[PDB]
Amino acid sequence: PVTLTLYNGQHAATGIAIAKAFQDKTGIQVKIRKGGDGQLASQITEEGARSPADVLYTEESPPLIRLASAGLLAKLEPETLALVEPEHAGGNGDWIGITARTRVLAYNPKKIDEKDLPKSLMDLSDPSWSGRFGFVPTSGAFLEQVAAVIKLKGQEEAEDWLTGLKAFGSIYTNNVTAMKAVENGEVDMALINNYYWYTLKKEKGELNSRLHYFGNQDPGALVTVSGAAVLKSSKHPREAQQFVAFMLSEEGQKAILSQSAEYPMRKGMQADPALKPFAELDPPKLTPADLGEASEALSLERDVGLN
Numbered sequence: 053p054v055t056l057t058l059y060n061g062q063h064a065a066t067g068i069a070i071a072k073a074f075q076d077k078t079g080i081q082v083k084i085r086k087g088g089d090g091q092l093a094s095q096i097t098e099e100g101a102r103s104p105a106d107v108l109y110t111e112e113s114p115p116l117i118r119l120a121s122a123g124l125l126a127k128l129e130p131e132t133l134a135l136v137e138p139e140h141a142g143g144n145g146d147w148i149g150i151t152a153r154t155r156v157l158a159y160n161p162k163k164i165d166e167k168d169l170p171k172s173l174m175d176l177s178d179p180s181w182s183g184r185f186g187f188v189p190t191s192g193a194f195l196e197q198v199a200a201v202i203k204l205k206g207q208e209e210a211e212d213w214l215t216g217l218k219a220f221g222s223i224y225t226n227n228v229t230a231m232k233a234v235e236n237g238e239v240d241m242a243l244i245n246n247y248y249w250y251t252l253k254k255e256k257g258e259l260n261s262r263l264h265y266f267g268n269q270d271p272g273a274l275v276t277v278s279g280a281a282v283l284k285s286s287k288h289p290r291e292a293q294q295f296v297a298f299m300l301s302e303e304g305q306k307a308i309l310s311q312s313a314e315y316p317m318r319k320g321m322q323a324d325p326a327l328k329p330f331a332e333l334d335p336p337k338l339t340p341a342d343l344g345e346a347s348e349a350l351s352l353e354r355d356v357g358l359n
């Protein structure tokens with residue numbers, strides 16, 4: 053008669069797949085509340101001591117850093133923490149990375165040749181790209197992207213960059229509609245996460261659009277980490293710890309990968325063969341702890357009037 057409540061900030065099918073796999077292994081039923089990362093973190097905070105959430109699962113790490121800093125997350129069992137590299141878990145061991153995703157530049161080669169793509173994320177503030185690219189200012193990974201630019205280039209250059217994006221980029225409500233606009237030639241390129249293209253490639257088969265990886269430790273080659281945590285207020289602490297530990301088992305990782313083209317955080321495990329290998333992403337040397345709560349980036353987005 054035990055039901056775990058999962059607050060799922062990850063994409064809906066991914067949360068459903070891991071809940072199904074967990075129930076199959078253990079017989080424990082999982083009830084899912086799906087929302088946005090920050091929305092669920094805010095809801096947990098306001099629900100206080102009587103929150104029903106047992107586990108929180110997010111697409112990005114700033115919400116988990118926020119909640120860990122606020123004192124709401126339970127410490128994870130040391131055997132769970134040993135399943136990932138230390139940079140992929142919270143500094144106090146109260147949240148853990150589950151998969152990693154990466155920033156990409158999706159483009160339509162009928163509208164722009166690969167040879168003519170911007171060399172760097174930083175080039176998109178230049179007037180020559182006016183009208184030619186989309187971005188998603190309300191996206192959690194875009195927040196992290198702004199945080200990365202601040203860390204790598206400084207606040208002054210990051211503000212000049214984001215001003216250029218406001219002047220010259222086209223705003224999309226989410227990564228899915230931005231990807232669709234590229235696929236349909238409504239915009240030449242867009243800044244999104246990598247897994248959206250693989251979802252399209254499965255639904256549709258033969259795509260117009262292609263992915264460009266900035267590589268070269270460019271700010272635009274940022275890798276971000278989707279993570280999980282047990283809530284201190286959980287009435288099922290053993291089962292909640294079992295759930296997070298199961299997410300990082302080979303079976304849980306495969307369950308999550310069956311719905312999202314992301315990189316496993318379980319050490320020693322490879323991704324789907326269709327993915328560009330993690331070793332070749334050449335991402336900037338930024339961890340979740342470096343981006344933190346992304347407070348400077350939210351302050352900048354608010355300053356510029358984008359989110």
Ligand SMILES: [Ga+3]
Nearest residue numbers: 063111227245
């Ligand atoms: Ga997403």
